[PDB]
């Protein structure tokens, strides 16, 4: 609803016998990636991944590269501690993932902050919506919770999320506005493919849209066909835009009873589509 987000996504993966853990970061504004960092690169540095961030000066790239390097070291300590918390051997590979950032409304004010973690793909600990307290998933994460309560760690996260996060996201929006503040509506169509004498597939397509959030549904006689609709995951085209389709198997002769409904932020009004022979 005119809103925007910034998110950073960190992955640290240990690899016993194959070096120290790898740390990768990516940063997004909404559905647009704009930076990366990879500790396995030949000379690890924050790098631009969108044209609108290229303008930032050498101080930007230098500062941020030192932040990632320090974070990577911190994640290495975290991974060691986590192996102990779960009584795990030194032989296995493990993964520590972090996601954090801020959502703002059309006026630029903070709507929500996030700062959370997963270990081996399972939720571990999360900063609560209040930005003051933590939810721990198990007794290991209660250890991290007690440490971070003692350290008043949430106060620091809060200060970032209400301050720098919002301020930098506002800047990025202004610098990248022609892309970041533009919704590209889906180009839509319906195809028809006989399966047999008795049945046909209707597939409703949405192409070329941004951002990625969309709803595609089929109705039969105005009734949603949730249980009978094949939906693919929304997927990137490679040109900043996204694609999706939804299909239904229908009795031959009944195609006109089916309507495809499309909702997207770039559409003034939801679309209704039918197969047009």
């Amino acid at each position: 609803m005119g809103s925007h987000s910034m998110r950073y996504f960190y992955t640290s993966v240990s690899r016993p016998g194959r070096g120290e853990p790898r740390f990768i970061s990516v940063g997004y504004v909404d559905d647009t990636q704009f930076v990366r960092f990879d500790s396995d690169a030949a000379s690890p540095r924050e790098e631009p991944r969108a044209p609108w961030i290229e303008q930032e000066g050498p101080e930007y790239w230098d500062r941020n590269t030192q932040i990632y390097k320090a974070q990577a070291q911190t994640d290495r300590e975290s991974l060691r501690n986590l192996r102990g918390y779960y009584n795990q051997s030194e032989a296995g590979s493990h993964t520590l993932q972090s996601m954090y950032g801020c959502d703002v409304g059309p006026d630029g004010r903070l709507l929500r902050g996030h700062d959370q973690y997963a270990y081996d793909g399972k939720d571990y600990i999360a900063l609560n919506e209040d930005l003051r307290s933590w939810t721990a998933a198990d007794t290991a994460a209660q250890i991290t919770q007690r440490k971070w309560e003692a350290a008043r760690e949430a106060e620091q996260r809060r200060a970032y999320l209400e301050g720098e996060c919002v301020e930098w996201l506002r800047r990025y929006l202004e610098n990248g506005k022609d892309k970041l503040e533009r919704a590209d509506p889906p180009k839509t169509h319906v195809t028809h493919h006989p399966i047999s004498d008795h049945e046909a597939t209707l597939r409703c397509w949405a192409l070329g849209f941004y951002p990625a959030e969309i709803t595609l549904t089929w109705q039969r006689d105005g009734e949603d066909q949730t249980q009978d609709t094949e939906l693919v995951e929304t997927r990137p085209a490679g040109d900043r835009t996204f694609q999706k389709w939804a299909a239904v198997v229908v009795p031959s002769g009944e195609e006109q009873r089916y309507t495809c409904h499309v909702q997207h932020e770039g559409l003034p009004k939801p679309l209704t589509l039918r197969w047009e022979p």
Binding site: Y8, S25, G27, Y60, R63, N64, I67, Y68, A70, Q71, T74, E77, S78, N81, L82, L96, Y100, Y117, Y124, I125, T144, K147, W148, A151, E153, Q156, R157, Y160, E164, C165, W168
Partner: peptide, 9 residues
């Protein structure tokens, strides 16, 4: 810009 000064788990 990413966040700085986070402590270990």
């Amino acid at each position: 810009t990413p966040q700085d000064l986070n402590t270990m788990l």
